[PDB]
Amino acid sequence: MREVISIHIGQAGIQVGNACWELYCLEHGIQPDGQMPDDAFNTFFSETGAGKHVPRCIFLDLEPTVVDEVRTGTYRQLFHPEQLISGKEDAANNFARGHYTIGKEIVDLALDRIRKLADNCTGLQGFLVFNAVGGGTGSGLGSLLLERLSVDYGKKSKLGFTVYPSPQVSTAVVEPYNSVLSTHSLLEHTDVAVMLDNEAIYDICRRSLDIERPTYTNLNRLIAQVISSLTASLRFDGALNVDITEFQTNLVPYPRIHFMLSSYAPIISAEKAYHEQLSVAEITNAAFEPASMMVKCDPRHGKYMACCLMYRGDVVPKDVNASVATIKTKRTIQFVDWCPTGFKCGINYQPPTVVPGGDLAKVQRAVCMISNSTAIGEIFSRLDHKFDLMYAKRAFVHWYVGEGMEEGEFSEAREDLAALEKDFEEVGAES
Amino acid sequence: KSAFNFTQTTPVFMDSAPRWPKENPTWPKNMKATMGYKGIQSNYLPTNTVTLKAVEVPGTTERNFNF
Numbered sequence A: 001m002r003e004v005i006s007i008h009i010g011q012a013g014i015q016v017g018n019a020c021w022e023l024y025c026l027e028h029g030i031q032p033d034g035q036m037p038d039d040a041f042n043t044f045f046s047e048t049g050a051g052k053h054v055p056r057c058i059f060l061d062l063e064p065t066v067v068d069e070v071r072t073g074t075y076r077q078l079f080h081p082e083q084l085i086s087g088k089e090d091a092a093n094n095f096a097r098g099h100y101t102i103g104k105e106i107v108d109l110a111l112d113r114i115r116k117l118a119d120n121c122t123g124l125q126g127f128l129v130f131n132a133v134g135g136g137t138g139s140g141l142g143s144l145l146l147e148r149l150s151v152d153y154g155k156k157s158k159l160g161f162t163v164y165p166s167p168q169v170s171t172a173v174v175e176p177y178n179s180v181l182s183t184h185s186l187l188e189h190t191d192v193a194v195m196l197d198n199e200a201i202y203d204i205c206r207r208s209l210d211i212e213r214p215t216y217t218n219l220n221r222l223i224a225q226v227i228s229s230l231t232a233s234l235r236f237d238g239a240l241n242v243d244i245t246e247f248q249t250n251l252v253p254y255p256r257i258h259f260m261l262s263s264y265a266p267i268i269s270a271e272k273a274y275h276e277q278l279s280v281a282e283i284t285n286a287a288f289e290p291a292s293m294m295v296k297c298d299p300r301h302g303k304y305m306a307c308c309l310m311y312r313g314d315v316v317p318k319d320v321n322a323s324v325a326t327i328k329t330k331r332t333i334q335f336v337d338w339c340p341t342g343f344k345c346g347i348n349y350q351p352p353t354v355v356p357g358g359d360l361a362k363v364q365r366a367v368c369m370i371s372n373s374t375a376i377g378e379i380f381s382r383l384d385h386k387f388d389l390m391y392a393k394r395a396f397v398h399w400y401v402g403e404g405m406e407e408g409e410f411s412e413a414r415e416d417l418a419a420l421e422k423d424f425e426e427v428g429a430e431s
Numbered sequence B: 001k002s003a004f005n006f007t008q009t010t011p012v013f014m015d016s017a018p019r020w021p022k023e024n025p026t027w028p029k030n031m032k033a034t035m036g037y038k039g040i041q042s043n044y045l046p047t048n049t050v051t052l053k054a055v056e057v058p059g060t061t062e063r064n065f066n067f
C-alpha cells in the first residue's frame, strides 16, 4: 500500500544498494534466500506464489564487473534476474557516453521494468534515486533516465541521494564536467535532492567511529542507517507519522531550492556507548552540530530555511518540543526571517537495527536530521570555479564533442549554475 | 362564504389541535429516509474511497483498478 520504487545507477549507486538491501533483509528477518521463518515490508518487497519476498528495486549500470558480484554473492537468490540491468561496455567517465551513445539503447529495457514494477504496487509514494554524480554512468544515465521518468510520470515524487564531488578528495580529473552537465537534468527533474560527499563521511568515520581503515564498505553502511531512519514511518508504526508528500511539502519553499544536507546522531562505537547516556536533548544537539554534517559545508555561514527530524527509539514528543525549544534560543543557529516555524518532526517507536559485524552500537535512541539551508551555496561554487578553470583551455573537450555533443551544452549547463547561485542569496533577502 | 369559517377570520376562540401525520413536540417524529448516491463514478465499479495514483501527468486517465 505505502510502496516506493528504489533505483540504483552507476557503481556507487549499486555499492550503496548492497548496503541498504543488506539492511532491509535484516530489518525484517528476510533470509538471503528470499523467504523468512503484513505491510511491515510491503513497502519494499512483493510475495510471489512460492514463499519468497523479492525487492522492488533496480540495479542499473554499464559495467558487468559490479553487477555480477551481486549475481555470485550470497544475495543472488533475492533479485529477479531481470531487474539487475547491466551493459556490454561502460561510459568511461564521460557525460556524453552516458547521455548520447550508450544510454539511449538500454532505457527502454529499464522502463519496461519500471512499468512492470509500477503495476505491482497499488499506491506509489514516490521514486528513490541513488545517484553518483561525477562519472559517466551515474551522471550521464541519471540525466537521461530522470527526464524519461518525468515524461512518463510527471509530478510523481523523485527523491535524489546523489554523492557529490568533494573539494579535496577527488578520485577523478574530469568529474568537474560531468557534474555540471548533470545539474540541469536533476534540477528540472528531481523533486528533492539530498547531497553528501565521500570526504565529509570520512572524518565522521575518523572522529566518531574511530576506524582508521575506512573504505567504501563503511560509508555505504551509513547511508543505510539514514534511509531506514527516513522510511520508518512508511513501514513502522509511530507517533507523528510522516510520509514523502508531507516531507517535501513543508521543506521546499520554492520549486528551485530543493538541495539539503543530512546529519545522523548518535555515531558511537560499541564501547563509548557505556561511557554515555544519549539523552534526546544531547543527540539533537549533536545533530545540528556542523561536524556531524554529511556534506563539507558550513551551516554557520548561511541560514536555515527549514529542517526535518526523524527520531527513532524510546522517544516521546514532550522531549522533542523541549530540546527544539532550546535550539530556537541558541544564537549560533540562525534562521531566515520568513520562517518563525521551521521544524517538521517525526517519531518512530522502532529503533534502528545493527548489522552483525557492523561498526555502530546497539542504541535505543537515534536522530536523523535533514535541513534545507542556504549555506549550501558554498559547495555549489567550487564547481563553478574549477569548471571555468579548465574550460578556458578547451581541455578534455575533444572527448565530449567527439561523442555526439557540441559546445553549447557547456554554456547552458554553466549558466544554470550561475542563475542557481544568486537564488541562494535571493532567498536570503532579509527585508 | 358562510358555512366555511375561513382561516383569515377565525378568532382564537376557534382553534384546531394538530394530529399525527404532522410534526409536533409531543409525539415522536420517527426516522426518515433519503437516497445515498452510487459513489465516486469511475470507469470500473464506483467506489467510496479515493486512492493514490502512479502516473500523475495532469489531465490523464490512468488507474490500477485490479490492485
Ligand SMILES: Nc1nc2c(ncn2[C@@H]2O[C@H](COP(=O)(O)OP(=O)(O)OP(=O)(O)O)[C@@H](O)[C@H]2O)c(=O)[nH]1
Residues within 6 Å of the ligand: A009, A010, A011, A012, A013, A015, A016, A062, A063, A090, A091, A092, A093, A094, A132, A133, A134, A135, A136, A137, A138, A139, A163, A171, A198, A216, A217, A219, A220
Ligand atoms: N559513498 C560511496 N561513493 C562511491 C562508491 N564507489 C564509488 N564512489 C564514488 O562514485 C564516484 C565515481 O562514480 P562511479 O559510480 O564509480 O562511476 P560511474 O558513475 O558509474 O561512471 P563509469 O565509470 O563510466 O561507469 C566517485 O566519486 C566514487 O568515490 C561507494 O561504494 N560508496
Ligand SMILES: [Mg+2]
Residues within 6 Å of the ligand: A010, A011, A135, A136, A137, A138
Ligand atoms: Mg563507473
